[PDB]
Design goal:
The PDB classes it as ligase. The chain has 312 residues and is an alpha+beta fold. 49% of the residues lie in helices and 8% in strands. The strands form 2 sheets. It has a 4-stranded mixed beta sheet with strand order 5-4-3-6. Bound molecules: 2-{[(thiophen-3-yl)methyl]amino}benzoic acid. 2-{[(thiophen-3-yl)methyl]amino}benzoic acid binds next to loops.
Amino acid sequence: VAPWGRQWEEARALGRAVRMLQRLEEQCVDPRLSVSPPSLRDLLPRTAQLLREVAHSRRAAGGGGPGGPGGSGDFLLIYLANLEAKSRQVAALLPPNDELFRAGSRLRRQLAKLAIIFSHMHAELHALFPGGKYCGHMYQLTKAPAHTFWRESCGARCVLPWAEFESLLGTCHPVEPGCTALALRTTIDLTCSGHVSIFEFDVFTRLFQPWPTLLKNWQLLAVNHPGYMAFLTYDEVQERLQACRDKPGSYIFRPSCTRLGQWAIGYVSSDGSILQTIPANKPLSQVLLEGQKDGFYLYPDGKTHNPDLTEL
Ligand SMILES: O=C(O)c1ccccc1NCc1ccsc1
């Protein structure tokens, strides 16, 4: 059943993935590294177990629903190829005690980004295959307009190549070609696979609500805002805000890695301490404007001028 070519090759790819994550977990013995999410030391066994559940489920089912691009088999082919490529990059960073960082550092930034991507891959798989059971054809996006767009444009498909997704999105929210399209791909493609899944679109539309001005929100909140930090961990935000400890009201924001679709705002309190706040269901600009009115969110990344969020 397409896109797989031979009978049992999806099963074999799943077995490969599990064994690869087992080895990769063996390479994470260093008691440094951290436990602060996202941590490979816990994500890797969780993701391996999820893949074991997927494998058992699709063996019993033999294996998926209708074949073709955008269904569960296609999703798994791309997902497992991506998982393998990212695992290879991680394995190249880790030892045969690991390399000392002590970051700062280019290398601990790379490793942190890979950890984030592993957190995103885990969440995507968990969202689309709860208990190992594919639900992409029934998946409900949180924002109703976004749900309606995805089902009218993409149908039952749970994943699309960037090019087709961009064409479909652009019938509704036009995407300026070139650098802007590439910045949008980078924001939306949480797993860094060059494909957009229904889960990634769910997260993007929750983060950059409200729907009618979606890409405007993204431009004002991500592209044009110096407080926005892409692919940053909790620990990295802490390290970054240390340098603004003497400037209460310094703040940065980032998509949470643990509560996907929600924001995490780190800021310097009037005590010089670093606090994190995760807003409710309000759009981000409302939380930021109220925090500016209240004195908490005055200096994005410690800079003097706070962008005006009234004007779209
Ligand atoms: O994919 C599945 O396992 C699947 C399972 C149940 C219902 C629909 C499904 N997929 C539709 C599809 C396939 C290619 S494009 C759209």
